[PDB]
Every structure is written in structure tokens, then in C-alpha cells.
Coordinates of C-alpha atoms and ligand atoms in Angstrom, one line a residue:
Chain A
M1 CA 46.1 -99.8 -203.8
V2 CA 48.1 -96.7 -203.9
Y3 CA 47.5 -93.6 -201.8
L4 CA 49.5 -91.0 -199.8
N5 CA 50.3 -91.7 -196.2
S6 CA 52.0 -88.4 -195.6
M7 CA 54.0 -85.7 -197.3
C8 CA 55.9 -82.9 -195.5
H9 CA 58.5 -80.3 -196.3
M10 CA 60.6 -77.5 -194.8
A11 CA 62.8 -74.7 -196.2
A12 CA 66.4 -75.4 -195.2
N13 CA 67.0 -71.7 -194.2
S14 CA 63.6 -71.4 -192.4
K15 CA 63.9 -69.1 -189.4
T16 CA 60.9 -70.6 -187.6
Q17 CA 61.7 -74.2 -188.5
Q18 CA 58.0 -75.0 -189.0
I19 CA 57.5 -78.3 -190.9
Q20 CA 54.7 -77.9 -193.5
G21 CA 52.5 -80.7 -194.6
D22 CA 49.4 -82.8 -194.1
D23 CA 47.7 -83.8 -190.8
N24 CA 49.3 -87.2 -191.0
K25 CA 52.9 -85.8 -190.7
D26 CA 53.1 -86.9 -187.0
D27 CA 51.9 -90.6 -187.7
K28 CA 54.3 -93.5 -188.0
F29 CA 54.5 -95.2 -191.4
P30 CA 56.9 -97.8 -193.0
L31 CA 60.0 -96.2 -194.3
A32 CA 61.6 -98.9 -196.4
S33 CA 65.1 -97.9 -197.6
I34 CA 64.9 -94.2 -196.6
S35 CA 65.9 -95.8 -193.3
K36 CA 69.4 -95.8 -194.8
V37 CA 69.4 -92.0 -194.5
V38 CA 68.7 -92.2 -190.8
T39 CA 71.5 -94.7 -190.5
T40 CA 73.6 -92.2 -192.5
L41 CA 72.9 -89.5 -189.9
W42 CA 73.9 -91.8 -187.1
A43 CA 77.2 -92.9 -188.7
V44 CA 78.0 -89.4 -189.7
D45 CA 77.4 -88.2 -186.0
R46 CA 79.3 -91.1 -184.4
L47 CA 82.2 -91.5 -186.8
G48 CA 82.5 -88.3 -188.9
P49 CA 82.2 -88.1 -192.7
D50 CA 86.0 -88.4 -193.2
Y51 CA 86.4 -91.5 -190.9
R52 CA 88.2 -94.5 -192.4
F53 CA 88.0 -98.2 -191.5
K54 CA 91.6 -99.4 -190.8
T55 CA 92.0 -103.0 -191.6
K56 CA 95.4 -104.2 -190.2
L57 CA 97.6 -107.0 -191.7
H58 CA 100.2 -108.6 -189.4
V59 CA 102.8 -109.9 -191.7
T60 CA 105.7 -112.3 -190.8
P61 CA 108.2 -113.8 -193.1
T62 CA 108.6 -117.7 -193.0
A63 CA 111.4 -120.1 -193.5
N64 CA 111.0 -120.6 -197.3
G65 CA 110.6 -116.9 -198.3
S66 CA 106.8 -117.0 -197.8
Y67 CA 104.7 -115.1 -195.3
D68 CA 102.2 -115.7 -192.5
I69 CA 99.4 -113.0 -192.4
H70 CA 96.8 -112.2 -189.7
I71 CA 94.0 -109.8 -190.6
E72 CA 92.8 -107.8 -187.7
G73 CA 89.5 -106.6 -189.1
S74 CA 87.9 -103.1 -188.7
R75 CA 84.3 -104.2 -189.4
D76 CA 84.5 -102.2 -192.6
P77 CA 80.9 -102.7 -193.9
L78 CA 82.1 -102.4 -197.6
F79 CA 84.7 -105.2 -197.8
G80 CA 83.6 -107.3 -200.7
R81 CA 84.9 -108.4 -204.1
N82 CA 86.2 -105.0 -205.0
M83 CA 88.1 -104.4 -201.7
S84 CA 89.4 -108.0 -201.9
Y85 CA 90.8 -107.5 -205.4
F86 CA 92.4 -104.3 -204.2
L87 CA 93.9 -106.1 -201.3
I88 CA 95.3 -108.8 -203.6
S89 CA 96.7 -106.1 -205.9
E90 CA 98.4 -104.5 -202.9
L91 CA 99.9 -107.8 -201.6
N92 CA 101.4 -108.3 -205.1
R93 CA 102.8 -104.8 -205.2
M94 CA 104.5 -105.6 -201.9
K95 CA 105.8 -108.9 -203.4
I96 CA 103.6 -111.0 -201.1
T97 CA 102.4 -113.9 -203.3
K98 CA 103.4 -116.9 -201.2
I99 CA 101.2 -117.1 -198.1
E100 CA 101.6 -120.1 -195.8
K101 CA 99.0 -119.2 -193.2
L102 CA 96.2 -116.6 -193.7
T103 CA 94.3 -116.0 -190.4
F104 CA 91.5 -113.5 -189.6
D105 CA 89.6 -112.3 -186.5
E106 CA 85.9 -111.7 -185.9
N107 CA 85.9 -108.0 -187.0
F108 CA 87.0 -109.0 -190.5
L109 CA 83.6 -108.8 -192.3
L110 CA 83.7 -110.2 -195.8
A111 CA 80.6 -110.3 -198.0
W112 CA 81.3 -111.1 -201.6
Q113 CA 80.4 -116.0 -189.1
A114 CA 84.0 -117.3 -189.0
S115 CA 83.1 -120.5 -190.9
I116 CA 81.5 -118.4 -193.7
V117 CA 84.4 -115.8 -194.1
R118 CA 86.9 -118.8 -194.2
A119 CA 84.8 -120.2 -197.0
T120 CA 84.6 -116.9 -199.0
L121 CA 88.4 -116.4 -198.5
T122 CA 89.1 -119.9 -199.8
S123 CA 86.4 -119.8 -202.5
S124 CA 87.0 -116.3 -203.8
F125 CA 89.9 -114.4 -202.3
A126 CA 92.6 -117.1 -202.7
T127 CA 91.1 -118.5 -206.0
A128 CA 91.5 -117.1 -209.5
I129 CA 90.4 -113.5 -210.0
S130 CA 87.7 -112.6 -212.6
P131 CA 89.4 -110.7 -215.5
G132 CA 85.9 -109.4 -216.3
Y133 CA 85.2 -107.8 -212.9
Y134 CA 89.0 -107.1 -212.3
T135 CA 89.7 -105.0 -215.4
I136 CA 86.4 -103.1 -215.0
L137 CA 87.6 -102.4 -211.4
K138 CA 91.1 -101.5 -212.4
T139 CA 89.9 -99.2 -215.1
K140 CA 87.5 -97.6 -212.6
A141 CA 90.3 -97.4 -210.1
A142 CA 92.4 -95.5 -212.7
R143 CA 89.6 -92.9 -213.0
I144 CA 90.1 -91.9 -209.4
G145 CA 93.9 -92.2 -209.8
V146 CA 94.4 -95.5 -207.9
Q147 CA 97.0 -97.9 -209.3
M148 CA 96.4 -101.6 -209.3
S149 CA 98.5 -104.6 -210.5
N150 CA 98.1 -106.4 -213.9
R151 CA 97.3 -110.0 -213.4
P152 CA 97.7 -110.0 -209.6
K153 CA 97.9 -113.5 -208.1
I154 CA 98.0 -114.9 -204.6
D155 CA 98.9 -118.5 -203.3
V156 CA 97.5 -119.4 -199.9
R157 CA 98.1 -122.8 -198.4
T158 CA 96.1 -122.5 -195.1
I159 CA 93.2 -120.3 -194.0
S160 CA 91.8 -120.1 -190.4
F161 CA 89.9 -118.1 -187.9
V162 CA 91.8 -116.7 -184.9
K163 CA 89.9 -114.7 -182.3
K164 CA 91.1 -111.1 -181.7
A165 CA 91.4 -111.8 -177.9
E166 CA 93.6 -114.9 -178.6
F167 CA 96.0 -113.3 -181.3
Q168 CA 99.5 -112.2 -180.5
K169 CA 101.7 -110.7 -183.2
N170 CA 105.1 -112.4 -183.6
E171 CA 107.9 -110.0 -182.7
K172 CA 109.2 -110.6 -186.2
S173 CA 105.9 -109.4 -187.7
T174 CA 105.2 -106.1 -189.5
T175 CA 101.9 -104.3 -189.1
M176 CA 100.4 -102.9 -192.3
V177 CA 97.2 -100.9 -192.7
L178 CA 94.7 -101.0 -195.5
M179 CA 92.4 -98.1 -195.0
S180 CA 88.9 -97.8 -196.5
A181 CA 87.7 -94.9 -198.5
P182 CA 86.2 -92.3 -196.2
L183 CA 82.9 -93.0 -194.7
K184 CA 81.1 -90.4 -196.9
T185 CA 82.0 -92.5 -199.9
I186 CA 80.8 -95.7 -198.2
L187 CA 77.5 -93.9 -197.4
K188 CA 77.3 -92.6 -201.0
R189 CA 77.6 -96.1 -202.4
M190 CA 75.0 -97.3 -199.8
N191 CA 72.5 -94.6 -200.7
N192 CA 72.9 -94.9 -204.4
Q193 CA 71.4 -98.4 -204.3
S194 CA 72.3 -101.3 -202.0
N195 CA 71.0 -104.5 -200.5
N196 CA 70.6 -104.5 -196.8
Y197 CA 74.3 -105.4 -196.1
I198 CA 76.1 -102.1 -195.7
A199 CA 73.2 -100.3 -193.8
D200 CA 72.6 -103.2 -191.4
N201 CA 76.3 -103.7 -190.6
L202 CA 76.7 -100.0 -189.9
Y203 CA 73.7 -100.1 -187.6
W204 CA 75.1 -103.1 -185.7
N205 CA 78.6 -101.7 -185.6
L206 CA 77.2 -98.6 -183.9
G207 CA 75.5 -100.7 -181.2
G208 CA 72.1 -101.8 -182.8
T209 CA 68.6 -100.9 -181.6
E210 CA 69.4 -100.1 -177.9
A211 CA 72.1 -97.6 -178.9
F212 CA 70.0 -96.3 -181.7
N213 CA 67.0 -95.6 -179.4
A214 CA 69.4 -93.9 -177.0
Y215 CA 71.0 -91.8 -179.8
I216 CA 67.7 -90.6 -181.4
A217 CA 66.2 -89.8 -177.9
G218 CA 69.2 -87.5 -177.1
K219 CA 69.5 -86.1 -180.6
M220 CA 65.8 -85.4 -181.3
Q221 CA 63.8 -85.9 -178.1
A222 CA 62.2 -88.7 -180.1
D223 CA 60.4 -91.7 -178.5
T224 CA 58.9 -94.8 -180.1
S225 CA 55.8 -92.9 -181.1
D226 CA 58.1 -90.8 -183.4
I227 CA 60.4 -93.5 -184.7
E228 CA 60.8 -97.3 -184.2
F229 CA 63.8 -99.0 -185.8
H230 CA 64.8 -102.7 -185.9
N231 CA 67.6 -102.5 -188.5
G232 CA 69.7 -100.1 -190.6
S233 CA 68.1 -100.9 -194.0
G234 CA 64.4 -100.7 -193.4
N235 CA 63.9 -104.3 -194.8
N236 CA 61.3 -106.6 -193.2
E237 CA 62.5 -108.4 -190.1
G238 CA 59.5 -110.5 -189.7
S239 CA 57.4 -112.3 -192.3
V240 CA 54.8 -111.6 -194.9
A241 CA 52.3 -112.9 -192.3
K242 CA 54.0 -110.9 -189.4
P243 CA 55.9 -108.0 -191.0
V244 CA 58.2 -105.9 -188.9
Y245 CA 59.3 -102.6 -190.7
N246 CA 61.2 -99.6 -189.4
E247 CA 58.6 -96.8 -189.1
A248 CA 58.7 -93.1 -188.4
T249 CA 56.8 -89.9 -188.9
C250 CA 57.2 -87.7 -191.9
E251 CA 58.3 -84.8 -189.6
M252 CA 61.1 -87.1 -188.2
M253 CA 62.4 -87.5 -191.7
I254 CA 62.6 -83.7 -192.1
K255 CA 64.5 -83.5 -188.8
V256 CA 66.8 -86.2 -189.9
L257 CA 67.6 -84.3 -193.2
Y258 CA 68.0 -81.1 -191.3
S259 CA 70.5 -82.6 -188.8
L260 CA 72.3 -84.6 -191.5
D261 CA 72.8 -81.4 -193.6
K262 CA 74.0 -79.5 -190.5
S263 CA 76.6 -82.2 -189.6
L264 CA 77.9 -82.5 -193.1
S265 CA 78.1 -78.7 -193.5
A266 CA 80.4 -78.5 -190.5
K267 CA 83.1 -80.4 -192.5
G268 CA 82.4 -78.6 -195.9
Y269 CA 80.0 -81.3 -197.3
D270 CA 76.5 -81.3 -198.8
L271 CA 73.8 -84.0 -198.9
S272 CA 75.0 -84.8 -202.4
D273 CA 78.2 -86.1 -200.8
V274 CA 76.3 -88.9 -199.2
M275 CA 73.0 -89.2 -201.2
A276 CA 72.1 -89.6 -204.8
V277 CA 71.4 -86.7 -207.2
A278 CA 68.5 -87.1 -209.6
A279 CA 69.6 -87.8 -213.2
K280 CA 73.3 -87.3 -212.3
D281 CA 74.1 -90.4 -210.3
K282 CA 73.6 -93.0 -213.0
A283 CA 74.4 -96.0 -210.7
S284 CA 71.6 -95.0 -208.3
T285 CA 67.9 -95.5 -208.1
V286 CA 67.3 -91.8 -209.1
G287 CA 69.6 -92.0 -212.2
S288 CA 66.6 -91.7 -214.5
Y289 CA 64.5 -89.2 -212.6
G290 CA 63.5 -86.6 -215.2
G291 CA 61.7 -83.3 -215.3
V292 CA 62.3 -80.5 -212.9
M293 CA 63.9 -83.0 -210.4
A294 CA 66.8 -83.7 -212.8
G295 CA 70.0 -82.0 -211.4
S296 CA 68.1 -80.3 -208.6
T297 CA 67.0 -83.0 -206.3
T298 CA 69.1 -85.1 -203.9
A299 CA 67.2 -88.1 -202.6
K300 CA 66.8 -91.6 -201.4
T301 CA 64.1 -94.1 -202.5
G302 CA 62.4 -96.9 -200.7
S303 CA 60.2 -99.8 -201.7
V304 CA 58.6 -102.5 -199.5
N305 CA 55.4 -104.5 -199.6
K306 CA 53.3 -101.7 -197.9
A307 CA 55.2 -98.6 -198.9
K308 CA 56.9 -96.6 -201.6
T309 CA 58.9 -93.7 -200.2
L310 CA 61.3 -90.8 -201.1
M311 CA 63.1 -88.1 -199.1
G312 CA 65.8 -85.6 -199.6
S313 CA 66.2 -82.0 -200.7
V314 CA 65.1 -80.0 -203.7
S315 CA 67.0 -76.9 -204.9
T316 CA 64.5 -74.3 -206.1
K317 CA 64.7 -70.6 -207.0
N318 CA 63.3 -70.0 -203.5
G319 CA 66.1 -72.0 -201.9
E320 CA 66.9 -75.6 -200.6
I321 CA 63.8 -77.4 -199.3
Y322 CA 63.7 -80.7 -197.4
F323 CA 60.9 -83.1 -198.3
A324 CA 59.6 -86.6 -197.5
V325 CA 56.9 -88.5 -199.3
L326 CA 55.5 -91.7 -197.7
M327 CA 53.1 -93.6 -200.0
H328 CA 51.0 -96.6 -199.1
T329 CA 51.1 -99.6 -201.5
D330 CA 49.8 -103.2 -201.6
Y331 CA 52.6 -104.8 -203.6
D332 CA 51.5 -108.3 -202.4
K333 CA 48.1 -107.9 -204.1
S334 CA 49.2 -105.7 -207.1
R335 CA 52.9 -105.7 -208.0
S336 CA 52.1 -102.8 -210.3
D337 CA 51.6 -100.5 -207.2
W338 CA 55.3 -99.6 -206.9
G339 CA 55.4 -98.1 -210.4
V340 CA 52.1 -96.3 -209.9
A341 CA 53.3 -94.9 -206.5
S342 CA 56.7 -93.9 -207.9
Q343 CA 55.2 -91.6 -210.6
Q344 CA 52.8 -90.1 -208.1
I345 CA 55.7 -89.3 -205.8
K346 CA 57.6 -87.8 -208.7
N347 CA 54.7 -85.6 -209.6
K348 CA 54.3 -84.4 -205.9
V349 CA 57.9 -83.5 -205.6
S350 CA 57.8 -81.8 -209.1
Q351 CA 54.8 -79.8 -207.9
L352 CA 56.7 -78.7 -204.7
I353 CA 59.5 -77.4 -207.0
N354 CA 56.9 -75.6 -209.3
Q355 CA 55.4 -73.9 -206.3
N356 CA 58.8 -72.5 -205.2
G357 CA 59.7 -70.8 -208.4
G358 CA 61.0 -73.9 -210.3
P359 CA 64.2 -75.7 -210.1
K360 CA 67.8 -74.5 -209.7
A361 CA 70.6 -76.9 -210.6
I362 CA 73.0 -77.9 -207.8
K363 CA 76.8 -77.9 -208.2
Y364 CA 77.6 -81.5 -208.6
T365 CA 79.8 -83.8 -210.6
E366 CA 78.9 -87.6 -210.6
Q367 CA 81.1 -89.4 -208.0
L368 CA 82.5 -92.8 -208.5
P369 CA 82.2 -94.4 -205.0
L370 CA 84.7 -97.3 -204.7
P371 CA 85.5 -98.9 -201.3
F372 CA 89.1 -97.7 -201.6
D373 CA 90.8 -94.5 -202.8
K374 CA 94.3 -93.2 -203.2
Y375 CA 95.0 -93.4 -199.4
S376 CA 94.0 -97.0 -199.2
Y377 CA 97.4 -98.4 -200.2
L378 CA 99.0 -101.0 -197.8
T379 CA 101.2 -98.9 -195.5
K380 CA 103.2 -99.6 -192.4
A381 CA 101.6 -98.5 -189.1
Chain B
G1 CA 52.4 -126.1 -216.3
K2 CA 52.6 -124.6 -212.8
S3 CA 54.2 -121.4 -211.6
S4 CA 57.0 -121.5 -208.9
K5 CA 57.0 -119.0 -206.1
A6 CA 60.7 -119.8 -205.6
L7 CA 61.6 -119.0 -209.3
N8 CA 59.6 -115.7 -209.2
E9 CA 61.3 -114.6 -205.9
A10 CA 64.7 -115.4 -207.3
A11 CA 64.1 -113.6 -210.5
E12 CA 63.0 -110.4 -208.6
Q13 CA 65.9 -110.5 -206.1
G14 CA 68.5 -111.0 -208.8
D15 CA 69.7 -114.5 -207.9
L16 CA 70.9 -115.8 -211.3
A17 CA 72.2 -119.2 -210.1
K18 CA 68.9 -120.1 -208.4
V19 CA 66.9 -119.0 -211.4
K20 CA 69.2 -121.3 -213.5
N21 CA 68.7 -124.2 -211.1
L22 CA 64.9 -124.1 -211.2
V23 CA 64.6 -123.4 -214.9
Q24 CA 67.0 -125.9 -216.5
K25 CA 65.5 -128.7 -214.3
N26 CA 62.3 -128.0 -216.4
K27 CA 59.7 -128.6 -213.8
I28 CA 58.3 -125.1 -214.6
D29 CA 56.4 -123.5 -217.5
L30 CA 58.1 -120.1 -217.8
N31 CA 54.9 -118.6 -219.2
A32 CA 52.8 -119.8 -216.3
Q33 CA 51.4 -116.8 -214.3
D34 CA 51.0 -116.8 -210.6
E35 CA 48.1 -115.6 -208.4
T36 CA 48.5 -111.9 -209.3
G37 CA 49.3 -112.7 -213.0
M38 CA 53.1 -112.4 -212.6
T39 CA 55.7 -114.3 -214.7
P40 CA 59.4 -114.9 -214.0
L41 CA 60.2 -112.3 -216.7
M42 CA 58.0 -109.7 -215.1
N43 CA 59.7 -110.3 -211.8
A44 CA 63.2 -110.0 -213.4
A45 CA 62.2 -106.8 -215.2
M46 CA 60.7 -105.2 -212.1
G47 CA 63.9 -105.8 -210.2
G48 CA 66.1 -104.4 -212.9
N49 CA 68.0 -107.7 -213.2
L50 CA 69.4 -107.6 -216.7
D51 CA 71.3 -110.9 -216.6
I52 CA 68.2 -112.8 -215.6
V53 CA 66.2 -111.0 -218.3
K54 CA 68.7 -112.1 -220.9
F55 CA 68.7 -115.7 -219.5
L56 CA 64.9 -115.8 -219.8
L57 CA 64.9 -114.3 -223.3
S58 CA 67.3 -117.0 -224.4
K59 CA 64.5 -119.5 -223.4
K60 CA 62.1 -117.6 -225.7
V61 CA 59.5 -116.7 -223.1
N62 CA 56.4 -114.8 -224.1
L63 CA 57.0 -111.1 -223.7
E64 CA 53.4 -109.9 -223.8
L65 CA 51.7 -111.6 -220.9
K66 CA 50.1 -109.1 -218.4
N67 CA 49.7 -109.2 -214.6
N68 CA 46.5 -108.1 -212.8
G69 CA 47.5 -104.4 -213.3
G70 CA 47.5 -105.0 -217.1
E71 CA 51.3 -104.6 -217.3
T72 CA 53.8 -106.5 -219.5
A73 CA 57.4 -107.1 -218.5
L74 CA 58.3 -104.0 -220.5
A75 CA 55.8 -101.8 -218.6
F76 CA 57.4 -103.2 -215.3
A77 CA 60.8 -102.3 -216.5
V78 CA 59.9 -98.7 -217.5
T79 CA 57.7 -98.0 -214.5
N80 CA 60.4 -99.2 -212.0
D81 CA 63.2 -97.2 -213.8
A82 CA 65.0 -100.3 -215.0
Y83 CA 65.8 -98.6 -218.4
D84 CA 68.7 -101.0 -219.1
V85 CA 66.2 -103.8 -219.0
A86 CA 63.7 -101.8 -221.0
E87 CA 66.2 -101.3 -223.8
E88 CA 67.0 -105.0 -223.8
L89 CA 63.3 -105.9 -224.0
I90 CA 62.6 -103.4 -226.9
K91 CA 65.5 -104.9 -228.9
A92 CA 64.1 -108.4 -228.2
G93 CA 60.8 -107.3 -229.9
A94 CA 58.7 -106.4 -226.9
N95 CA 55.5 -104.5 -227.9
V96 CA 56.0 -100.7 -227.1
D97 CA 52.4 -99.7 -227.8
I98 CA 51.2 -100.6 -224.3
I99 CA 49.5 -99.0 -221.3
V100 CA 51.1 -98.8 -217.8
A101 CA 49.1 -99.2 -214.6
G102 CA 47.1 -96.5 -212.8
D103 CA 43.9 -94.5 -213.4
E104 CA 45.3 -92.2 -216.2
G105 CA 46.1 -95.1 -218.6
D106 CA 49.4 -93.5 -219.4
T107 CA 51.2 -94.9 -222.5
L108 CA 54.6 -96.5 -222.1
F109 CA 55.9 -93.7 -224.2
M110 CA 54.5 -91.0 -221.8
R111 CA 56.1 -92.7 -218.8
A112 CA 59.5 -93.0 -220.5
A113 CA 59.3 -89.5 -221.8
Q114 CA 59.1 -88.0 -218.3
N115 CA 62.2 -90.0 -217.2
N116 CA 64.6 -91.6 -219.8
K117 CA 65.1 -89.9 -223.1
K118 CA 67.0 -92.8 -224.6
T119 CA 64.2 -95.3 -224.0
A120 CA 61.6 -92.7 -225.1
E121 CA 63.5 -92.5 -228.4
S122 CA 63.7 -96.3 -228.7
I123 CA 59.9 -96.5 -228.3
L124 CA 59.3 -94.0 -231.1
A125 CA 61.8 -95.8 -233.4
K126 CA 59.3 -98.7 -233.2
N127 CA 56.2 -96.6 -233.6
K128 CA 56.6 -92.9 -234.5
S129 CA 52.9 -92.2 -234.0
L130 CA 53.1 -92.8 -230.2
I131 CA 54.4 -89.2 -229.8
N132 CA 50.7 -88.1 -230.0
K133 CA 48.8 -91.2 -228.6
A134 CA 46.7 -89.9 -225.8
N135 CA 45.9 -91.6 -222.4
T136 CA 42.4 -92.1 -220.9
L137 CA 42.1 -88.4 -219.9
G138 CA 43.0 -87.4 -223.5
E139 CA 46.5 -86.3 -222.5
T140 CA 49.8 -86.9 -224.3
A141 CA 53.5 -86.7 -223.0
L142 CA 53.4 -83.0 -223.8
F143 CA 50.7 -82.6 -221.0
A144 CA 52.8 -84.5 -218.5
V145 CA 55.9 -82.6 -219.2
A146 CA 53.9 -79.3 -219.3
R147 CA 53.0 -80.0 -215.7
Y148 CA 56.2 -81.5 -214.3
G149 CA 59.0 -81.1 -216.8
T150 CA 61.3 -78.5 -218.3
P151 CA 61.5 -76.4 -221.6
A152 CA 64.2 -78.9 -222.8
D153 CA 61.7 -81.8 -222.3
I154 CA 59.1 -79.8 -224.3
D155 CA 61.8 -79.2 -227.1
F156 CA 62.5 -82.9 -227.1
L157 CA 58.9 -83.7 -227.6
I158 CA 58.4 -81.1 -230.3
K159 CA 61.5 -82.5 -232.1
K160 CA 59.8 -86.0 -232.1
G161 CA 56.6 -84.5 -233.7
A162 CA 54.4 -83.4 -230.8
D163 CA 51.1 -81.7 -231.9
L164 CA 50.8 -78.4 -230.0
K165 CA 47.1 -78.0 -230.5
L166 CA 45.6 -81.1 -228.8
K167 CA 43.0 -80.7 -226.1
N168 CA 42.4 -83.2 -223.3
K169 CA 39.0 -84.4 -222.2
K170 CA 38.4 -81.3 -220.1
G171 CA 39.1 -79.1 -223.1
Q172 CA 42.5 -78.1 -221.8
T173 CA 45.7 -77.6 -223.9
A174 CA 49.1 -78.5 -222.6
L175 CA 49.6 -74.7 -222.0
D176 CA 46.5 -74.7 -219.8
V177 CA 47.7 -77.6 -217.6
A178 CA 51.2 -76.0 -217.3
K179 CA 49.6 -72.9 -215.8
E180 CA 47.3 -74.9 -213.5
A181 CA 50.3 -76.7 -212.2
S182 CA 52.2 -73.5 -211.6
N183 CA 55.0 -74.5 -214.0
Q184 CA 56.2 -71.1 -215.0
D185 CA 59.0 -72.3 -217.3
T186 CA 57.0 -74.7 -219.4
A187 CA 54.0 -72.3 -219.6
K188 CA 56.4 -69.6 -220.9
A189 CA 57.9 -71.9 -223.4
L190 CA 54.6 -73.4 -224.6
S191 CA 53.0 -70.0 -225.0
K192 CA 55.8 -69.1 -227.5
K193 CA 56.0 -72.3 -229.6
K194 CA 54.6 -72.2 -233.1
Ligands
LIG1 C1 64.8 -100.4 -199.7 O1 63.7 -99.9 -199.8 C2 64.9 -101.6 -200.5 N1 63.9 -102.6 -200.4 C3 64.0 -104.0 -200.4 O2 65.1 -104.5 -200.4 C4 62.6 -104.7 -200.4 C5 62.5 -105.6 -201.6 C6 61.9 -106.8 -201.4 C7 61.8 -107.8 -202.4 C8 62.3 -107.4 -203.7 C9 62.9 -106.1 -203.9 C10 63.0 -105.2 -202.8 C11 66.1 -101.5 -201.5 N2 65.9 -100.2 -201.9 C12 64.6 -100.1 -203.1 C13 64.4 -98.7 -203.5 O3 65.4 -97.9 -203.4 O4 63.3 -98.4 -204.0 C14 65.0 -101.1 -204.0 C15 63.7 -101.7 -204.7 C16 65.9 -100.6 -205.1 S1 65.8 -102.4 -203.0

């Protein structure tokens, strides 16, 4: 069954900072993947929107004109196929195609623990590259002015795990850095649409639940009656019998948006630099949002068994307004509930816009959020 | 045959290989519906998983089965914003003259029209009359857009043949509902259209 748990809003430029909405705006409800926006705030506060993950390669020539390479990982939470293909392209451009020994430490997170990363490296990294995925990437890379090799290839004899604590660079080794795109791009990719991986790895990298509870307490004077998190993504930790969802109040979601916007603003950024724009970000869950929301609304969606959710900002003739809509669903019993709830949320948000003099388009051009950019080229440290 | 919980979960989550493992083994009737009336195809559609949809279509599954909310795979695709999948299903011959879940009985056309113009056009190319097919409350897409849309959405609908004079079951015009919903811009536009 579909019904509203709580909706709330607040004008961004509100002097009084009074959060308007229903009498349930102070009750905890399941958030689903709007949790990713809270994770965004934390990452933005702890690292900065321009932060970059600096993966290091320790590169030593070997007897036969080959190289040994050790990857000192940065826990970059967006190091998958795409970033791997870029790495391979970069090794080629540096004329590294013969690798005797490839080793990696525990901070080298690779999702296409040591046992599994070794397997993905052997299975995927060192194997043949997909022309399908590669050319698509290369052509995307070109759109943001990043150069990649044609038919890059790598040959790796041996792959193995070597703990950070137990690694010593040879004195004949050269240290190279492969920087991620800035965090804001990573967060944009995450918030457009993602499985749990990026969000959950950010949340863990920042210290997990203990550190989160400490952060939100300091930041917002929030206790567990306001917000209770178990992961970064909002996905169920328990079972369909015993579900465990991140929950928080609708007011807390408004405070999160307020604080996120303030921290981004201090570096010249807007919510649209880390969250999806209705009808403009086509690779996002809001790519087909129509009506008064199209071009005016920056937002994150969520869906889980018991909830359909949306939060973000609307740009109206009366100004920027933060909003959060938390709907109840019973997707277990009626899979149709998500679609029913999704349109009711849309209509509520459209009504909020109507009541504030109608929409006003934001300044935004659709971004292409790859895990690397033009500063990600392998470079000597 | 029997439905598989594992196949249905795989299809929703977007795990192509697991879907292929369970299907090709052929222990599973692909048209069998589970406890809430779901098929593998409805699961794939709902999750926006185009490759799984294509795989299932190559097995010639029935497109028109309905879950307990009365929804076909195409209604799942439209209502969950999987408009890539929706276009695939429409090209594969999925019936467009269907109702999506909820009390209003909105038509598929009306839901697409509020969100994805391309798909709304693809629906009308199959059945041009849907432009004016009313839901349970006697409301067309014009009404929904009058409430929650833009003058450009209204122009879109008029270009596809929207009747301006229709009245819902309460005796309201689309202009009436625009005003009731405080949508200044659509009320303005609707007052002026001839
Ligand atoms: C966050 O809400 C999401 N939810 C899930 O991953 C739960 C789930 C469980 C089974 C099958 C699909 C999803 C991700 N964000 C959703 C959203 O933005 O609405 C999503 C459905 C795109 S997945």
C-alpha cells in the first residue's frame, strides 16, 4: 500500500530557518538511496569537493627490459573497469607492456579481499580488453579532452598481494601517481544512479558507523532518534524477515541539504555538481522526470521494500527550496507500489513548485562523470 | 511449470549470466507467475535491465501477463522510468492500450506523457486515439499536465490531437484543474488555446 510518511521543505534563503511540513517531520523513516546524499555531505566535509584519490605505482625495470610494479592503493571507491582501462592505456603510453610482477596492497579496491582483487586483476585487468566497452570509454574520454591509446595491451606474468606494512620500494624504483577525478565527480556518478558499492566504500573509508555517529552529533546535534545509519547506501543490512534500513527524519534530510549546499558553496559549487538534475542528467534516475520539475529540480531518489523517497532542491520563481518526500510502500506484497509512489512524489513536488510561483530553470549543462579526468595521467611523484 | 524466486531476483537486479544459467537449463516456465503475479520479464522491466529484457524477448515470452496490481511488463517499465526498456517492449509488440496501477486508473499514455515525450509518441504511433482516452476519474493527459506540467507539455498534447473541451467526472475542464492546483502557467496557456 502506498501512503505518505512525511514531506517537508524549507526556502534556502530563509532567515528564520523554520522547516515547514507535516507533523510526522520529526519521525524516523527508511531513507533508501537518499542515504547517499548524507554520505555525500560527510565526504564533502571530511575530504573537500576537489579532493582526489592518489593511487601510486612503484615501477622498477627488470633484467629483460620488463618492469615490476607495486600498486599502493588509495581506496578510490570508483576504481572499476573504466579506471582499469585508463590505467592500461597509461601504462602503454609510458611504454610499459611487459610486466614480470604486479603486486598490490589492501587499499587497492577493485570492483569490476586480496584473493578477490588478485582474481579480478588476472581475469579482467591483465586479460584482453573489450573493444565494445573500450571504444565507448575512449570516445567518452575524448568528450572531456582525455587522450587514451588505440588497442592498448598489457602482459603480466605474475600477480600477488603484498601488504602495505610489508612493502619496501626498491631504490631503483620510480613512484608514479594515477589520480582520480575530483571527489565531486565521483559523488555525481554515485548520485546519478549506483549500486551500493561507491556509497558503502566511502562510508567505510571515512570510519563507518562509529565515526558517522560522532560526525552527525557534532555537525547537527543529532542523536539516534533523529538519524540511525548502518551503511552509506541505505540498502537493507538484515533480511526480508529482519530488515535493517538507515532511517532518519524528514527534518534531518532538510538540514543535510542545507549543510551540503553551504559546504559546496564555499568552493563555488552547487547541488547540481554532486546530485542529478531532473530531465538533464540522462544517465540518472531523474533523467525522465517531466513537468515543472524538468530543468528546475536537483534530486536523489530511493527505493526499498518499505519506502520510496526523494530529496533535493527546487528552483522556483520565489527562490531555491529544499524538500524531502518519504513515502511508505509494501513492495513485497505489491511490486506495483514503487511506480504508484513515484508518481505521487512527483505530483507533490510539482505542487510545491506551483505554490511558489512556478519553476525557474537552473544554470546547468549535463556533466559526463568518468572516474578520471585530464589530470589523472600517470605522473612522477 | 513453476516460477523460480532466484530467476526473478536475478532479472530485477540485472544479473544477466545468472538469468542465462537458470533459463537455458529449462527447469523453468518463463510465463509462470509467482505469488504476487510477477514474471521474470516484469522483474527485468521494473529494474530497467535492457539486456535481460532482450534475452527474454528472444525466448518469446508472453508480454501481456499482469501482476496483482494489474500491470504488464510495459506498465512496469513506464512507471519505473525505464523508458529504454519501454521502447524495446513497444517495438516487440507489447500492447500500449493498458492501465497502470493506482486508484486513478491512469493510462499508460498519460503516465508516459507526464515524463518521457519519446515514449508518449511511440504509444500514439500504435494507437492515435489514446491521446483522448480518459482514466477512471474521466481525466486525460491534458488534465495531469494542466496540474503538474508546463505550457510546452500542453502544446505537445495539443499537437497530438488533445480535445480541449473534455470534462472529468466532477464536471471540471483541464483549465479548472490547472487553477485548483495553482499552476499559473498552464491555466494561462489553457485559457488562451482555441
Ligand atoms: C537506493 O534506493 C537503491 N535501492 C536498492 O538497491 C534496493 C533494491 C533492491 C532490489 C532491487 C532493486 C533495488 C538504488 N537506488 C534506487 C532508486 O534510486 O530509486 C534504485 C531502484 C535505482 S537502486
